Amino acid sequence: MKNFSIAKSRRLRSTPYTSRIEKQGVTAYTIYNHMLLPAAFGSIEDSYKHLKEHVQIWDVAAERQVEISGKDSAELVQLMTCRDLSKSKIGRCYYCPIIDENGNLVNDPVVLKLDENKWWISIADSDVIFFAKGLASGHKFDVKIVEPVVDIMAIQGPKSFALMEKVFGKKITELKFFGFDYFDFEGTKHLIARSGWSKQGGYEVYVENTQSGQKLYDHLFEVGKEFNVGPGCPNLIERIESALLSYGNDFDNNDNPFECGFDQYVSLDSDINFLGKEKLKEIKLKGPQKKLRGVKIDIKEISLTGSKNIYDENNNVIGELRSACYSPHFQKVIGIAMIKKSHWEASQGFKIQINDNTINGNVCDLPFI
């Protein structure tokens, strides 16, 4: 078979939105944090054009929360990330690389400061919950760690602002990027952040009152018709163009923040303790020997399922292509590659095999646009 079906089970968790999206045209799934995440609603290029011009409602429930509350909750959150949260404020979100004893990436969540003693870690695809539980047990921290009943619905695209203002009024229009607050829908208060995994604008509703969230989802579709609302999901083209990086795809637990472009989030000259601070000082002094870069490849199609080596002019491996797609903007294939320091330079040439032919590419900066 060309395509393979996904085998559902309790373990591949469904979401509060599954039954809806399956009547709205979902065509493919991925699995993210042991949960169904839509991967396509038909054509990826059509979804991309629609996202950049209208507004979409997304089931991103698979962006699970790790809730850490209690006396030592701030310190435990800080312990896991190289980002300095000492001046963090309630009502703000923070992109926080989580690192291990080697200084290597575990996850790249968004952290929400709900209170000094209550934090939500909105995670990429790894079981941060068990990292946090292990750390807390070993450090004898006085915290409570749970995966709360939170199921994010995102509203993304340039008409997200107009749609959300229609539903919630003027107060939501004051919400700054990466801020959050609480908004009433039909008597129920929901936490809503201005965030999401696109650079096309919008919001993430952190649904705790599940039935009210399901009704809000339906209401967004009913009153969003004038904005050409449609279902959607994180878009491969958009996210590669925007260089929105994906744990497990572009970087993994063998990479450190300096190999990923996370330099601005590694706080080494402050007094905070975090895992691997250690080794991260050593890595920053010497400099990385590999780094994520963009590539352009002159061909019109690709289906990347895993890493592909890229090669030099002497057929020595000089990097690894990790994410890729056809970009209508460039009218060629673009992608994200971990490249050796020999071939870093924007415009450096390389060779790659697609099917059984050697095809030329060039290295470029991120983001692409």
* Contact residues for a second copy, defined by CB under 8 A: 1, 3-14, 22-23, 26-31, 34, 39-40, 100-101, 106, 125-140, 147, 246-249, 253, 275, 303-307, 322-323
56 binds, among a second copy, ligand THG, Na ion, none (CB under 5 to 8 A by kind): none
Q: How far is residue 214 from each of residues 190, 209, 313, measured CA to CA in Å? A: 12, 9, 55
Residue closer to ligand THG, measured from CB, 73 or 198: 198
Spell 184-203 as b/e; 16+ CB within 10 A means b. ebeeeebbbbbbbbbbbbbb
CA distance 216 to 184: 11
Contact set for Na ion, span 303-362 (CB under 5 A): none
Number of residues that bind Na ion (CB under 5 A): 5
Shortest Å, Cβ 109 to ligand THG: 5
238 binds, among Na ion, a second copy, ligand THG, none (CB under 5 to 8 A by kind): none
Contact set for Na ion, span 145-174 (CB under 5 A): none
Other residues' Cβ atoms within 10 Å of the Cβ of residue 166: 16
Contact set for ligand THG, span 20-79 (CB under 6 A): 63
User: Would you give the DSSP letter of residue 185?
Assistant: E
94 marked as binding residue = no
Picking from 307, 298, 293, the residue whose alpha carbon sits closest to that of residue 341 is 293
CA distance 54 to 229: 7
Residue closer to a second copy, measured from CB, 42 or 349: 42
**Which of 18, 21, 33, 37 is close enough to bind Na ion by CB under 5 A?**
37
CA distance 103 to 268: 12
Picking from 139, 112, 117, 121, the residue whose alpha carbon sits closest to that of residue 71 is 117
**Would you give the binding string for ligand THG spanning residues 202-231, x where CB under 6 A is met?**
--x---------------------------
13 binds, among a second copy, Na ion, ligand THG, none (CB under 5 to 8 A by kind): a second copy
Stretch that binds Na ion, among 13-21, 84-92, 170-178, 207-215 (CB under 5 A): 13-21
Q: Is 61 in the site for Na ion (CB under 5 A)?
A: yes
Q: Which run of H or of E encompasses 198? A: none
CA distance 64 to 127: 9
204 marked as binding residue = yes
Determine if residue 202 is left, alpha or beta; phi over 0 gives left, psi from -120 to 50 gives alpha, anything else beta.
left
195 binds, among Na ion, a second copy, ligand THG, none (CB under 5 to 8 A by kind): ligand THG
122 marked as binding residue = yes
Spell 356-367 as b/e; 16+ CB within 10 A means b. eeeeebebbebe
Side chain identity at 338, as an amino acid letter? Answer: M
Contact residues for Na ion, defined by CB under 5 A? 15, 37, 59, 61-62
Residues annotated in a binding site for (6S)-5,6,7,8-tetrahydrofolate:
122, 204, 206
Contact residues for ligand THG, defined by CB under 6 A? 63, 95, 108-110, 122-124, 178, 195-197, 204, 244
